[PDB]
Design a protein around this nucleic acid. Structure first.
Ligand SMILES: [Ca+2]
Ligand SMILES: [Ca+2]
Lengths: 156, 158
DNA sequence: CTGCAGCTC
DNA sequence: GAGCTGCAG
C-alpha cells in the first residue's frame, strides 16, 4: 500500500468498510473489530444477535446464555494496554467472550469468562462511570475460563 | 476492486491501510482514522502543537494560545441528525471546539470553530457516561459566533 | 491508575 | 432521551 496516496489510503479505509457491510460481515460505521467479533461468536454459538444499542449483552445463545462480546486487536502480545477491554457499565449478562485478533484480523485467542470472574477482575473508573477488565494471560488461563480459540477459528 | 476480494483479504486490507497511514504519520493510533486525521488537518491549518494523545480536555494549542478540542464525524447522510452527534465531552477546559465533518470519501465537507461557551449552551448531559453531548447541527454551525473553517481545512488536505 | 476516539436506536 | 464499539499514557 506504500504506492497509494494518502487520499487513496483514506478512500480504501472507507470502501473496505462499505464492502464489509455490504457482505453483512459488519453492520455499523465503527471500525470492524467489534461487529466482526460479534459475528464470529454468533456463528460459533448459533446465537441471536441483539439490537445494536441494547444494554448489557450482545448475543443470546440457543441454550439461553447472554453473551457480552469484547474484542481487541493485538499488535504486540507483550503490550498490556492492548489487553484493555471496552468499559462495562452493566453486569446483567451470563458470560463475556473475549476475542483477541492479530494484526491481520485473524483470531489469535478467544475465551469465555463467567460474569462473576469478570467482576472479580474488574476495576472501577469514576471518570467514565464503568468497569475496566484486562484480558491478561492470567484471566485467559483462569481455571473457570473456557478456551474458545479453536471454536472461533472454525467459523472464520 | 474490493468486491472481488475474499472476506479474509478485505479484513487484512482494513488492517494494512491503517498500518500504512500510521507509518506515514497521518494517524498515530489504532483507532479508526477519522479522529487522528481530523487532528492532523487542524494542526496543518493552525500550525499548532499537538497535545499528548491521552491529554484531557483539548487536542491542539494554537500559536496564539487557543486550546482546541477537535471533534470529527464522517457524514454519509447530510440530513441525518444522529450523524452530527459529537464524541462525549467530560471536561470544558478548552477555548474552542473545531468540528470537522468528513464525507464518506474522507474529504472535508464542513468545518467550524465553536467557542466553548457556545458548545456548553448546546450540550445535554448524559448521566450514563458522565459526559456532555453536543450535536453539530446546522443551527450550531451557522451560529453568529462560529467561524467557518471549511476552506482552511480544505486547503491542507491532499 | 489516569485518560482517548475499540484504543446507534 | 436511551444507548454502543467515533484504543493510549
Ligand atoms: Ca460488546
Ligand atoms: Ca478530540
Amino acid at each position: 500500500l506504500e504506492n497509494l496516496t494518502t487520499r487513496e489510503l483514506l478512500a480504501v479505509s472507507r470502501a473496505s468498510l462499505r464492502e464489509l457491510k455490504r457482505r453483512g460481515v459488519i453492520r455499523s460505521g465503527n471500525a470492524p473489530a467489534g461487529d466482526y467479533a460479534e459475528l464470529l461468536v454468533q456463528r460459533a454459538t448459533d446465537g441471536e444477535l441483539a439490537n445494536a444499542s441494547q444494554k448489557s449483552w450482545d448475543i443470546r445463545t440457543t441454550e439461553g446464555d447472554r453473551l457480552q462480546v469484547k474484542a481487541r486487536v493485538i499488535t504486540d502480545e507483550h503490550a498490556n494496554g492492548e489487553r484493555q477491554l471496552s468499559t462495562i457499565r452493566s453486569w446483567d449478562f451470563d458470560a463475556a467472550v473475549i476475542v483477541l485478533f492479530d494484526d491481520n484480523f485473524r483470531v489469535w485467542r478467544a475465551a469465555r469468562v463467567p460474569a462473576a470472574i469478570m467482576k472479580e477482575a474488574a476495576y472501577y473508573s469514576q471518570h467514565v462511570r464503568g468497569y475496566t477488565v484486562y484480558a491478561k494471560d492470567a484471566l485467559l488461563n483462569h481455571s473457570e475460563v473456557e478456551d474458545w480459540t479453536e471454536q472461533l477459528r472454525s467459523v472464520e
